[PDB]
Write a structure and sequence with these properties.
Layout lengths: L5 E2 L5 E9 L4 E7 L5 E8 L7 H13 L8 E7 L2 E7 L4 E2 H5 L6 H20 L2 E2 L8 E3 L5 E3 L6 E2 L19 H4 L7 H16 L9 H10 L11 H10 L10 H4 L3 H6 L7 H12 L2
Parallel strand pairs: 1-5
Antiparallel strand pairs: 2-3, 3-4, 4-6, 5-6, 7-9, 8-11, 9-10
Helix pairs in contact: 3-5, 5-7
The chain binds ligand SKE and magnesium ion.
The site of the ligand Nc1nc(Nc2ccc(S(N)(=O)=O)cc2)nn1C(=O)c1c(F)cccc1F has 16 residues, from strand 2 and strand 6.
Length: about 290
């Protein structure tokens, strides 16, 4: 699966300053010397880790197979010394979680972001891929409001001989009950995580956010599903309820949710999200 691994990355890319901790390794800003576009370079010390190597292999494989404006564009993977360079487009607006830091979102912003996440999920699920770590931190925005899915290190792939997955992966607050129970599951697991992400975008945090992650591992399969509480519109509450069904076959598909009243009534053009990005830039500058 490493068939298209490249060599000598610094002949095509310039590595610039560090921009953050990656799901694996550290991520640096960089320049594509061929276009002068800015890229993100995830650098992984293959020597330091080895248990994670399978997850690193999976991230590259999944990224290399995606071609969508709703999934972080993949440039390639490059070997240098003991380091692996995973190169992707740089998105200048930060994550949806970042954008929540200064204050609450309104329902137009929530709907716009959810609509784009849904387009990303529709793409992935049509490719028989399951993201398995949907949450605001893995939703990235361009500086002008485009919304893309990121961090495919625990993504799953269905095939003709593997029609379900059963791996225990994800982030506990966002995990579907059937994933926690390690039942056979599919793309409907992402739809549950989308429901939790909708609560996260509305309330600023997922249900059970104050609890130790191990505690929520028993609470989620046991308890009734979360609902969105507070003075939110009925269609937003219904959107969340639709996603957060304990029985996965009763959850809608991403395509179906793109037609939900909440999305149709409230989603607007993505360029309006620049206001959110500007709010974050102002907020960050005085922290
Ligand atoms: N492709 C990509 N672009 C960005 N951009 C970005 C811009 C600004 C900020 S911030 N609000 O100042 O901390 C953060 C990120 N990240 N990115 C990644 O793959 C990436 C990721 F998914 C998760 C964590 C770190 C990353 F680096
Ligand atoms: Mg991540």
């Amino acid at each position: 699966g490493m068939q298209n691994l490249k060599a000598d990355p610094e002949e095509l890319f310039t590595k610039l300053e560090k921009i953050g901790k990656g799901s694996f390794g550290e991520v640096f800003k960089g320049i594509d010397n061929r276009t002068q576009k800015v890229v993100a370079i995830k650098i992984i010390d293959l020597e330091e880790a080895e248990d994670e190597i399978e997850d690193i292999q999976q991230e590259i494989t999944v990224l290399s197979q995606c071609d969508s404006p709703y999934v972080t564009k993949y440039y390639g993977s490059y070997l240098k010394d003991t380091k692996l360079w995973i190169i992707m487009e740089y998105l200048g607006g930060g994550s949806a979680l970042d954008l929540l830091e200064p204050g609450p979102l309104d329902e137009t912003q929530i709907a716009t972001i959810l609509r784009e996440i849904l387009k990303g999920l529709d793409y992935l699920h049509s490719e028989k891929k399951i993201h398995r770590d949907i949450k605001a931190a893995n939703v990235l925005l361009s500086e002008h409001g485009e919304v893309k899915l990121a961090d495919f290190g625990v993504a799953g792939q269905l095939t003709d001989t593997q029609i379900k997955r059963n791996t225990f992966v994800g982030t506990p607050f966002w995990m579907a009950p059937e994933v926690i129970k390690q039942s056979a599951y599919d793309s409907k697991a992402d739809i549950w995580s989308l429901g939790i992400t909708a609560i996260e975008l509305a309330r600023g945090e997922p249900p059970h956010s104050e609890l130790h992650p191990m505690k929520v591992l028993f609470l989620i399969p046991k308890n009734n599903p979360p609902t969105l509480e507070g003075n939110y519109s009925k269609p937003l509450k219904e959107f969340v309820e639709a996603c957060l069904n304990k029985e996965p076959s009763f959850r809608p598909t991403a395509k179906e949710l793109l037609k939900h009243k909440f999305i149709l009534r409230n989603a607007k053009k993505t360029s309006y999200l620049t206001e959110l990005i500007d709010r974050y830039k102002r907020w960050k500058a005085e922290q």
